Write a protein that binds this ligand. Structure first.
Ligand SMILES: COCC(=O)Nc1c(Cl)cc(C)cc1Oc1cccc(C(N)=O)c1
Ligand SMILES: [Zn+2]
Length: 140
């Protein structure tokens, strides 16, 4: 579990969105596993605006923050899970690292701020849904 709080927005994994998130929906994309909803109070997270390929992510199944190298956002085939059938997930970055289903929502951060959240993984890998291209998160 986990979320990004930026301005008047809440960024969560789409498969973990609550009834409040859907009722207060701003934007969602099933192929990216992302959902953004409106908030009453302001958040303090800063979204990175960069092309960094090194950062640190939080792994709840280990209670640890790991330094990782990751690929640039891409269209990647992701196997069937409890939440989605086997499909191509877009804007996805991969790193070699530990991850379990309940690790989704763990933040990946670089020196510039939040890069994304844990969205896919298994077999020694971890995948993160990029949020650095969502420029509108920084305004209105
Ligand atoms: C057979 O793999 C099922 C599974 O739950 N693997 C998995 C494992 Cl180990 C680890 C993680 C972090 C995610 C994982 O899968 C999911 C779960 C929720 C959503 C998505 C998606 N966005 O397509 C992918
Ligand atoms: Zn950066």
């Amino acid at each position: 579990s986990g979320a990004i709080y930026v301005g008047n927005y809440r960024v969560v994994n789409r498969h973990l969105a609550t009834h409040n998130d859907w009722a207060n929906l701003v934007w969602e994309d099933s192929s990216r596993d992302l959902l953004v909803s409106s908030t009453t109070a302001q958040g303090c997270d800063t979204i990175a605006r960069c092309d960094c390929q090194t950062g640190v992510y939080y792994c709840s199944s280990r209670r640890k923050h790991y330094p990782v190298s990751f690929s640039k956002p891409s269209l990647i085939f992701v196997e069937a899970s409890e939440y989605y059938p086997a499909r191509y997930q877009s804007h996805l970055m991969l790193a070699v690292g530990h991850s379990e289903p309940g690790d989704c929502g763990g933040i990946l951060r670089c020196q510039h701020g939040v890069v994304g959240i844990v969205s896919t993984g298994g077999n020694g890998l971890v995948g993160f849904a990029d949020v650095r291209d969502l420029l509108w998160l920084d305004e209105e």
